[PDB]
């Protein structure tokens, strides 16, 4: 039931929660360019 | 009203007497299984 | 916040606080529950000559919070205008518990030979002999002998 | 004229059960509650809330309410002939001409089952006669010639409060069960126009009268009314629950208690709480009854886990997301993304982008501590990460620019008690540690008392439920 | 009508008890008038608009005489002045900073939820405007952000009609929260971190701290104690008694 006030109102989808958890890390060369940085 | 409400509700509490009826069923089952 | 307006140490601003009480006490049921202590201050003060009304709103707020033996204490402390009421919630439930204490007290003192009792506090017996006359002069004496059951 | 036979059928199926059957279930019954037709009738009220009720349009106008409210009489055993009258009046809608006799002519129609005869003695038939006509009138609030009549119909329901209070007998386990619903609709129709003012004292004294003599499903439901009253308007009398916490019934309706704990979770959320508020939000969350009502958990869940957003330890919440809620959580998805991100310009640009939906929430408590939540997310992550970090590393990794406010951060984090981390006091430069080898053996078996004592509590509860 | 109510209008303090003469006049206002049961007809509330005015000025008297029961008294009067059901009043003059007086007093006495009912009673005038409120609420964000130096950055400009006593109590809630938070779980501080977190380089008040909290004033050096934790050995028999009542509760039930 919803007898309240509220009546007023996998391809990547599976990997999507991790994607937004991956949305803060080098999304996808500077990794590999760091090789020649030193 | 003034002093006439509580024992009516006490007889209502004979659902506990119905609990005794349930335990009576129980001990019936047990006594007769033991008879077996 | 209606009790901080009481630094005037006479009853003459306690009366304005009570004129606020009997106006909006049901809205301010949240407010008096902290003020239980100063209602005690009003009951303890014999110079506070409105201590009848102190015990009145004391039994009111304790009827709200669900205190019942202290509702009995300050129900006896409420005075002579206490029993006379004809209201259908407050006064009849608390005189129900009060004369329930009267009959269990008369049972315990009927279980207590020759005195050494708890004496009649000075605001019992009111609706005993006043609603008893309702039962008598309503010309059916079954309550009039039911009290004789209940007192032993 | 072929569809109105379906209200003709369900109407008689309702008041057959209600009138005759629950009157026979009121005569001598109700050992605890043998009025099973009361719960049957609340099921049919949910059925009239699924469907159109009886006569909102139904291809005609105003057929059943002038019809069936006559002639109940409760007499000599040929009152099934008055039921035969009720049944064989149904040639009027199919064959004859329908005429308008609702919402205007109802004012003597309600007085007809009293002015026929001394019908019967019990109030659930009176609550029937003022509820089962008038609840089919409330859900059409188009505010033109319909809402003043909801107003007067629930003034007759205030007369039903009067005839609930002075009716001669535990008929409150029918009338409070109907009155929960209809007093919610009271609050609805009263607050479709303005805030309700003396209806507050109506509700107060109505809570008072249901105190001990009949304390069955009235106190908790009227307290939901009072709670949502104090919720929709200014917030002064939550100290009333802090001083008069009498909120514990049998928790009967099994969803009333759930949403009750939800509403008081919003209360403790807006008073101040993380822990107790999030655990009663969690208990109401897992005490969601079903999903048989479309998308009604969803907006209320958006406002439910605001405190879990305020924890900072929340991931994206997407498992709840109705796709019809997506176009409304276009702010809220990026808001929990702003919880996962530590950006400051995005922390205020989500606000600068969605302040109107944040006002639709209307909770400033989230943004008054959500920056502090961002810095506590930072301190939880990095203080769980490294043993002896420096305050400069985390500080100028999160743009603090000075040692002394990083000192105040670490100091108020010790004051908030997450990690041991102290300062190698010369100019800052934290000397600290993590905490493994804290304890692992006698400390579980401290909590295992609560584990298995909770288990044996539920054992005895299943015993007292096996009793039924 | 009733001219002499205004007898203390514009000079604000020649004494304490001439304000007591005004207190007797407001006592006669309580005899004759009694603002709360007065329902409507809003010309019997215009002398109550005057009462709102001169009792805002009486709240200014309450901060002038330092009386905190009188402060909470007249502040609960103002709280009731926004509470009586004729909300359609002339717009209150000291409205912006009576909320600020109450809020900064609350911030001084360390409350935990009346802060948020303050954030709920009038939220819409907090972010857009009202520096008497807009400055304390972001100031609270800065206080529990991690800066007791935003205190002095702010005290650059906060008299705000006698918040001076309350920001002195705010200095007090700096210093006794230093008395707590000076070594909660610290190694050790020295004279200079006392000089940074504390202020007023050395009075007899940080010396009073070192001789008042049970403190070891080390050689230009500080320690909470010689072990800082009072050294934190039988977890068995108390849980054996727990086993007694635990087996007991598993008994009597099936």
Curated annotation (Swiss-Prot), chain A:
Tissues in which the protein is found: Expressed in limb bud, craniofacial primordia and skin.
* Stored InterPro entries: DSS1_SEM1
Q: Which UniProt keywords apply?
A: Nucleus, Proteasome
The record's Gene Ontology biological-process terms are: double-strand break repair via homologous recombination; mRNA export from nucleus; proteasome assembly; proteasome-mediated ubiquitin-dependent protein catabolic process
Q: Which GO terms describe its cellular component?
A: cytosol; integrator complex; nucleoplasm; proteasome complex; proteasome regulatory particle, lid subcomplex; protein-containing complex
Stretches that traverse the bilayer: none
Locations listed in the record: Nucleus
> Subunit info?
Component of the 19S proteasome regulatory particle complex. The 26S proteasome consists of a 20S core particle (CP) and two 19S regulatory subunits (RP). The regulatory particle is made of a lid composed of 9 subunits including SEM1, a base containing 6 ATPases and few additional components. Belongs to the TREX-2 complex (transcription and export complex 2), composed of at least ENY2, GANP, PCID2, SEM1, and either centrin CETN2 or CETN3. Component of the homologous recombination repair (HR) complex composed of ERCC5/XPG, BRCA2, PALB2, DSS1 and RAD51. Interacts with the C-terminal of BRCA2.
What family classification does the UniProt entry report for this protein? Belongs to the DSS1/SEM1 family.
Q: What protein name does the entry list?
A: 26S proteasome complex subunit SEM1
Q: What organism, scientifically named, is this protein from?
A: Homo sapiens (Human)
Recall the taxonomic lineage recorded for the source organism. Eukaryota, Metazoa, Chordata, Craniata, Vertebrata
Primary gene name: SEM1
UniProtKB/Swiss-Prot annotation, chain B:
Quaternary structure per UniProt?
Component of the 19S proteasome regulatory particle complex. The 26S proteasome consists of a 20S core particle (CP) and two 19S regulatory subunits (RP). The regulatory particle is made of a lid composed of 9 subunits, a base containing 6 ATPases including PSMC5 and few additional components. Component of a complex with USP49 and RUVBL1. Interacts with PRPF19. Interacts with TRIM5. Interacts with NDC80. Interacts with PAAF1. Interacts, in vitro, with the thyroid hormone receptor (in a thyroid hormone T3-dependent manner) and with retinoid X receptor (RXR). Interacts with ERCC6.
The name of this protein is 26S proteasome regulatory subunit 8
Q: Where can this protein be found?
A: Cytoplasm; Nucleus
Q: What does this protein do?
A: Component of the 26S proteasome, a multiprotein complex involved in the ATP-dependent degradation of ubiquitinated proteins. This complex plays a key role in the maintenance of protein homeostasis by removing misfolded or damaged proteins, which could impair cellular functions, and by removing proteins whose functions are no longer required. Therefore, the proteasome participates in numerous cellular processes, including cell cycle progression, apoptosis, or DNA damage repair.
Q: Give the family from UniProt.
A: Belongs to the AAA ATPase family.
UniProtKB/Swiss-Prot annotation, chain D:
Q: Which SUPFAM superfamilies match?
A: Winged helix' DNA-binding domain (SSF46785)
Known Gene3D superfamilies for this protein?
Answer: 1.25.40.570, Tetratricopeptide repeat domain (1.25.40.10)
Which InterPro entries does the UniProt entry name for this protein? 26S_Psome_reg_C (IPR013586), CSN3 (IPR050756), PCI_dom (IPR000717), TPR-like_helical_dom_sf (IPR011990), WH_DNA-bd_sf (IPR036390)
Keyword Ubl conjugation recorded: yes
Sequence position, cross-link Glycyl lysine isopeptide (Lys-Gly) (interchain with G-Cter in SUMO1): 13
Tell me its family.
Belongs to the proteasome subunit S3 family.
PANTHER family per record: 26S PROTEASOME NON-ATPASE REGULATORY SUBUNIT 3 (PTHR10758:SF2), 26S PROTEASOME NON-ATPASE REGULATORY SUBUNIT 3/COP9 SIGNALOSOME COMPLEX SUBUNIT 3 (PTHR10758)
| Full protein name | 26S proteasome non-ATPase regulatory subunit 3
Swiss-Prot record, chain E:
The Phosphoserine modification is found at 13
Arranged from A to Z, the UniProt key words for this protein are: Isopeptide bond, Phosphoprotein, Proteasome, Ubl conjugation
Q: Does the keyword Ubl conjugation apply?
A: yes
Taken from the UniProt entry, a GO cellular component term is:
cytosol
Coiled-coil blocks:
none
Q: Name one GO biological process term.
A: proteasome-mediated ubiquitin-dependent protein catabolic process
Which intervals hold domain PCI? 69-235
Per UniProt, location of the Glycyl lysine isopeptide (Lys-Gly) (interchain with G-Cter in SUMO2) cross-link in this chain: 204
Q: What is its quaternary makeup? A: Component of the 19S proteasome regulatory particle complex. The 26S proteasome consists of a 20S core particle (CP) and two 19S regulatory subunits (RP). The regulatory particle is made of a lid composed of 9 subunits including PSMD8, a base containing 6 ATPases and few additional components. Interacts with DDI2. Interacts with TASOR.
Q: What does this protein do?
A: Component of the 26S proteasome, a multiprotein complex involved in the ATP-dependent degradation of ubiquitinated proteins. This complex plays a key role in the maintenance of protein homeostasis by removing misfolded or damaged proteins, which could impair cellular functions, and by removing proteins whose functions are no longer required. Therefore, the proteasome participates in numerous cellular processes, including cell cycle progression, apoptosis, or DNA damage repair.
Q: Which family does it belong to?
A: Belongs to the proteasome subunit S14 family.
Q: What is this protein called?
A: 26S proteasome non-ATPase regulatory subunit 8
User: Its gene?
Assistant: PSMD8
* Residue numbers of the full-length protein present here: 94 to 350 of 350
């Amino acid at each position: 039931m919803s007898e309240k006030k509220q009546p007023v109102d996998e391809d990547n989808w599976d990997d999507d929660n991790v994607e937004d958890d991956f949305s803060n890390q080098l999304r996808a060369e500077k990794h590999g360019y760091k090789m020649e940085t030193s | 009203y003034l002093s006439k409400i509580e024992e009516l509700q006490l007889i209502v509490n004979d659902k506990s007497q119905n609990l005794r009826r349930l335990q009576a069923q129980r001990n019936e089952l047990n006594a007769k299984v033991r008879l077996l | 916040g209606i009790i901080s307006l009481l630094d005037e140490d006479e009853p003459q601003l306690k009366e304005f606080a009570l004129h606020k009480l009997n106006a909006v006490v049901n809205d301010f049921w949240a407010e008096i529950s902290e003020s239980v202590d100063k209602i005690e201050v009003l009951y303890e003060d014999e110079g506070f000559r409105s201590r009848q009304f102190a015990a009145l709103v004391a039994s009111k707020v304790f009827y709200h919070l669900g205190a019942f033996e202290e509702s009995l204490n300050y129900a006896l402390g409420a005075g002579d205008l206490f029993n006379v009421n004809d209201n259908s919630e407050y006064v009849e439930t608390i005189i129900a518990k009060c004369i329930d204490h009267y009959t269990k007290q008369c049972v315990e003192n009927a279980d207590l030979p020759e005195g050494e009792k708890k004496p009649i506090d000075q605001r019992l017996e009111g609706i005993v002999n006043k609603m008893f006359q309702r039962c008598l002069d309503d010309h059916k004496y079954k309550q009039a002998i039911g009290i004789a059951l209940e007192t032993r | 004229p072929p569809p109105p036979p379906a209200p003709q059928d369900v109407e008689m199926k309702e008041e057959a059960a209600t009138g005759g059957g629950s009157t026979g279930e009121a005569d001598g019954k109700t050992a605890a509650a043998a009025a099973e037709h009361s719960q049957r009738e609340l099921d049919t009220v949910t059925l009239e809330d699924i469907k159109e009720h009886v006569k909102q349009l139904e291809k005609a106008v105003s057929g059943k309410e002038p019809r069936f409210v006559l002639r109940a009489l409760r007499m000599l055993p040929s009152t099934s002939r008055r039921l035969n009258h009720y049944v064989l009046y149904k040639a009027v809608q199919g064959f004859f001409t329908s005429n308008n006799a609702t919402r205007d002519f109802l004012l003597p129609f309600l007085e007809e089952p009293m002015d026929t005869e001394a019908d019967l003695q019990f109030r659930p038939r009176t609550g029937k006669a003022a509820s089962t006509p008038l609840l089919p009138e409330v859900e059409a609030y188009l505010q033109l010639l319909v809402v003043i009549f909801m107003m007067n119909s629930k003034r007759y329901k205030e007369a039903q409060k009067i005839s609930d209070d002075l009716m001669q007998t535990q008929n409150r386990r029918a009338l409070d069960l109907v009155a929960a619903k209809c007093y919610y609709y009271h609050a609805r129709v009263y607050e479709f126009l303005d805030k309700l003012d003396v209806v507050r004292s109506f509700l107060h004294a109505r809570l008072r009268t249901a105190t001990l003599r009949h304390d069955a499903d009235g106190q908790a439901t009227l307290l939901n009314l009072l709670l949502r009253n104090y919720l929709h308007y200014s917030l002064y009398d939550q100290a009333e629950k802090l001083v008069s916490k009498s909120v514990f019934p049998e928790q009967a309706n099994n969803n009333e208690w759930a949403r009750y704990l939800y509403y008081t979770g919003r209360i403790k959320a807006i008073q101040l709480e993380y822990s107790e508020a999030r655990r009663t939000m969690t208990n109401a969350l897992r005490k969601a009854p079903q999903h048989t009502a479309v998308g009604f958990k969803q907006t209320v869940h958006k406002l439910l886990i605001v405190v879990e957003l305020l924890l900072g330890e929340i991931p994206d919440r997407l498992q709840f997301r109705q796709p019809s809620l997506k176009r409304s959580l276009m702010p809220y998805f990026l808001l929990t993304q702003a919880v996962r991100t530590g950006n400051l310009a995005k922390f205020n640009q989500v606000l600068d982008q969605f302040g109107e939906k944040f006002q639709a929430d209307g909770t400033y408590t989230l943004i008054i501590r959500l920056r502090h939540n961002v810095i506590k997310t930072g301190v939880r992550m990095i203080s769980l990460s490294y043993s002896r970090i420096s305050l400069a590393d985390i500080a100028q990794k999160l743009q603090l620019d000075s040692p002394e406010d990083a000192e105040f951060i670490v100091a108020k984090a010790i004051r908030d008690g997450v990690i041991e981390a102290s300062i190698n006091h010369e100019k800052g430069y934290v000397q600290s540690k993590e905490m493994i080898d804290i304890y692992s053996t006698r400390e579980p078996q401290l909590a295992f008392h609560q584990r298995i004592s909770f288990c044996l509590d539920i054992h005895n509860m299943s015993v007292k439920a096996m009793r039924f | 009508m009733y001219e002499q109510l205004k007898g203390e209008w514009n000079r604000k303090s020649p004494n304490l008890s001439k304000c007591g003469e005004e207190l007797g006049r407001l006592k006669l206002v309580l005899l004759e008038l009694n603002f709360l049961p007065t329902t409507g007809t809003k010309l019997t509330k215009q002398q109550l608009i005057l009462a709102r005015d001169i009792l805002e000025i009486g709240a200014q008297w309450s901060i002038l005489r330092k009386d905190i029961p009188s402060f909470e008294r007249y502040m609960a009067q103002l709280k009731c002045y926004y509470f009586d059901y004729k909300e359609q009043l002339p717009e209150s003059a000291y409205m912006h900073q009576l909320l600020g007086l109450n809020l900064l007093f609350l911030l001084s006495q360390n409350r935990v939820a009346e802060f948020h009912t303050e954030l709920e009673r009038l939220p819409a005038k907090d972010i857009q405007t009202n520096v008497y409120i807009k400055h304390p609420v972001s100031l609270e964000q800065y206080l529990m952000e991690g800066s007791y130096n935003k205190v002095f950055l702010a005290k650059g400009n906060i008299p705000a009609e006698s918040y001076t006593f309350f920001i002195d109590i705010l200095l007090d809630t700096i210093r006794d929260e230093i008395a707590g938070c000076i070594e909660k779980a610290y190694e050790k501080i020295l004279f200079t971190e006392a000089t940074r977190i504390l202020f007023f380089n050395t009075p007899k008040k940080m010396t009073d701290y070192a001789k008042k909290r049970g403190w070891v004033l080390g050689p230009n050096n500080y320690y909470s104690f010689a072990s800082q934790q009072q050294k934190p050995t039988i977890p068995s028999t108390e849980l054996a008694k727990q086993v007694i009542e635990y087996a007991r509760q598993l008994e009597m039930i099936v």
